[PDB]
């Protein structure tokens, strides 16, 4: 019994590498953690982001731990576990710009629940960014968060990974990043981000949704395990125990 | 009764010899070898991040008392800095994308010590110039790379200088430059990364003038601090201490003598 696992290696702390290259997070804990339930060999494998779901697709690898969101889009082309977490975002901006000063610090919107009070924050915060550029990593539930709220206020600039907009915005290139919450907070106290900081409000549930294993239509018994394997570890503490050694929260749904 | 106290600088941008975690924790060659010294020392050990532009401002301007960021001894440097015995040497090589047809750049495999084998070494030079011809070449501004480039490739390869390798390795991948050159071990463990998928070390590796040996970078008349390190790195030399760490981060001997 085994089973390829695809990551990407450029989100920590959910998935990045060592300095040798060797895969580690979040993610590859509880993909190992995963496949000792269901009595599985597990091989670890990266793969870029924009070629993440043709190369599942492709049977490059038989499943996806990349901290991917579960989206109607994304259900189109690829069929997904029960969930294992839940995507929290926020803005991050030099800690000495103006841009700091953006409305609803620390405060947490659930756009599921809380849609009302969410619209006012993203419409204050849509003209307090006015004329500004911000980077946000292409084909992610941010850039279509990004789309849909700040599109004809911000000059909105997609890369291809985090790390890459995060070097455009201590660069000066870009005022704001957007990002998953978490992501940012372990990127801005790495030296490179020196003055960064996580500035506004939080976003959770709508367009963000859950975290999930991601696997091909057709591998109905490859659901099945992963399924009774994530019951499993979230009923014995194991994939929170996991969240708080790596994210120091809990990022369960 | 209690231990005096040191702040070592290190820039956190080159793996294996000085990176950080997740979580920006310093790690690293530098970090473990620094731990090391300060014990041997018999000194608390407080190690920052500086980026590599202002590591030597930093140092005069008195931010921290030590530098530990693969700093090769230099003439140039000497000017203006002091420096502890060395603790490493560098070792230089290329790298482009393995797809590229600078790959086939002679010869990959051989070593050339710039000291002892000057004459083969500025035969293959000669050999990698020409075969660069046109090219872009993308380095860390104000190393013994920089050096190296201007002095054998300047008016043959379009010379692009950044603040961080981390920058020209972004660059590599995305094919805004042809090659990269910098520290092999660095390199090498670069290319290991799921962002420099592809990239690989090409042609000769290099060693001796230019790159010199790696020291603490030190403020110039801090004779004390000198004093200090020099003892704790000949101590360390002595019980295998460099050549262990060396092993366990870069799987290559890094240390001079
Ligand atoms: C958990 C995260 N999900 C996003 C971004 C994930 C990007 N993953 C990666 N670079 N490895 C998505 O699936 O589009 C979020 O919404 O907060
Ligand atoms: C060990 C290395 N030294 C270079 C490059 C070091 C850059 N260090 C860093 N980014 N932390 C230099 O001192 O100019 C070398 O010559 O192979
Ligand atoms: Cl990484
Ligand atoms: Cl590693
Ligand atoms: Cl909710
Ligand atoms: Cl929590
Ligand atoms: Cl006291
Ligand atoms: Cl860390
Ligand atoms: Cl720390
Ligand atoms: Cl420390
Ligand atoms: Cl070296
Ligand atoms: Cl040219
Ligand atoms: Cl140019
Ligand atoms: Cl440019
Ligand atoms: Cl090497
Ligand atoms: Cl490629
Ligand atoms: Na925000
Ligand atoms: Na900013
Ligand atoms: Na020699
Ligand atoms: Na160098
Ligand atoms: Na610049
Ligand atoms: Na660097
Ligand atoms: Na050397
Ligand atoms: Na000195
Ligand atoms: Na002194």
Wanted: charged letters at 25%.
């Amino acid at each position: 019994k085994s089973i390829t696992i695809a990551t990407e290696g450029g989100y920590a702390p959910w998935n990045f590498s060592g300095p040798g290259g060797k895969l580690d997070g979040f993610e590859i804990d509880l993909a190992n953690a995963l496949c000792e339930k269901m009595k599985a060999k597990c091989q670890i494998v990266a793969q870029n982001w924009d070629g993440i779901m043709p190369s599942l697709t492709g049977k490059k690898y038989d499943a996806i731990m990349a901290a991917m969101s579960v989206t109607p889009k994304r259900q189109e082309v690829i069929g997904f576990s029960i969930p294992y977490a839940a995507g929290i975002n926020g803005f991050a901006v030099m800690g000495d710009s103006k841009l700091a000063e953006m409305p609803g610090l620390g405060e947490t919107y659930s756009l599921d629940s809380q849609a009302d009070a969410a619209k006012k924050a993203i419409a204050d915060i849509s003209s307090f960014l006015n004329g500004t550029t911000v980077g946000v990593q292409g084909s992610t539930t941010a850039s279509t968060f990004l789309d849909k709220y700040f599109k004809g206020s911000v000059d909105i600039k997609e890369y291809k990974s985090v790390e890459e907009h995060n070097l455009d915005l201590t660069s000066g290139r870009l005022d704001a990043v957007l990002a998953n919450a978490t992501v940012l907070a372990a990127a801005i106290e790495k030296p490179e981000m020196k003055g960064a900081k996580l500035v506004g409000p939080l976003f959770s549930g709508g367009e963000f949704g859950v975290v999930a294993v991601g696997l091909r239509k057709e591998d109905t018994a490859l659901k099945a395990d992963f399924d009774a394997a994530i019951k499993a570890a979230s009923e014995d503490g194991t994939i929170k125990t996991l969240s708080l050694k790596w994210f120091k929260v809990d990022v369960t749904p």
